[PDB]
């Protein structure tokens with residue numbers, strides 16, 4: 001391997017393309033993967049296993065998707081599992097395959113059937129704490145064996161997955177860590193204390209890395225707005241239309257589009273509502289014709305749209 005190497009030394013850059021900010025989190029991930037490809041990790045255990053602590057809407061899933069895409073060359077190459085739907089006893093059977101003579105037997109269990117059909121992939125468990133403690137045991141086994149045994153007794157190979165578990169447990173106490181005093185590492189410490197209270201220490205050690213996601217800064221969110229309206233620019237390029245934003249215009253979209261409790265979840269449909277909707281209005285009315293560079297500024301009733309007349 002030579003080109004596969006080149007991609008790994010430049011790995012962080014490849015991820016920052018799609019994931020703004022969260023640099024600490026990205027070293028963390030990228031490192032663990034270098035230790036894999038170098039061959040310093042136990043080869044009968046998955047490429048990497050992570051705990052993603054932190055607020056919602058600030059990059060967890062994105063990184064998950066991005067990683068998947070930059071490692072296995074597609075967003076499809078990742079499996080999302082929601083621990084909210086696994087709070088029951090009945091859960092275990094849906095995860096790996098309900099015992100014979102059961103509704104969802106031969107149709108398999110979606111986890112084991114996904115990994116079975118796609119052995120090199122990223123796997124995302126959301127709200128790992130919401131999981132029924134039975135389901136944990138199944139995960140732990142997998143974390144040590146790189147193997148799981150489904151209902152039909154067929155053994156499923158996880159030695160080529162990256163495992164990522166998100167949880168919001170820390171969050172209300174990384175808010176105190178946001179307030180400077182607790183910088184790079186001290187948060188990753190004071191959180192461990194709360195983690196021990198919810199998670200057994202056998203579990204917190206199969207884990208390759210515990211990663212703290214921080215909230216976003218205005219300038220960061222501003223960047224996300226750009227990446228966020230990439231498809232639209234491309235869409236508009238087909239009719240040769242440009243979209244200069246203003247400093248304030250970006251800030252407006254950022255203002256409306258970042259809920260603290262939800263991060264940038266709302267953003268995409270804010271952009272859609274505040275910028276795409278009125279832009280369609282203009283385009284259809286003819287105030288924007290094929291060719292124009294449209295300028296976009298803030299006002300009292302939201303975004304306002306300027307076109308230079310013809311030279």
Ligand SMILES: Nc1ncnc2c1ncn2[C@@H]1O[C@H](COP(=O)(O)OP(=O)(O)O)[C@@H](O)[C@H]1O
Pocket residue numbers: 018019020021022055056057058059060061062063224263264265268
């Ligand atoms: N750091 C980031 N880099 C790029 N996009 C981000 C970032 N943080 C949030 N987003 C945007 O927020 C949206 C959803 O966020 P998500 O990945 O679900 O965060 P979480 O998993 O914490 O809920 C995505 O469209 C994504 O583009």
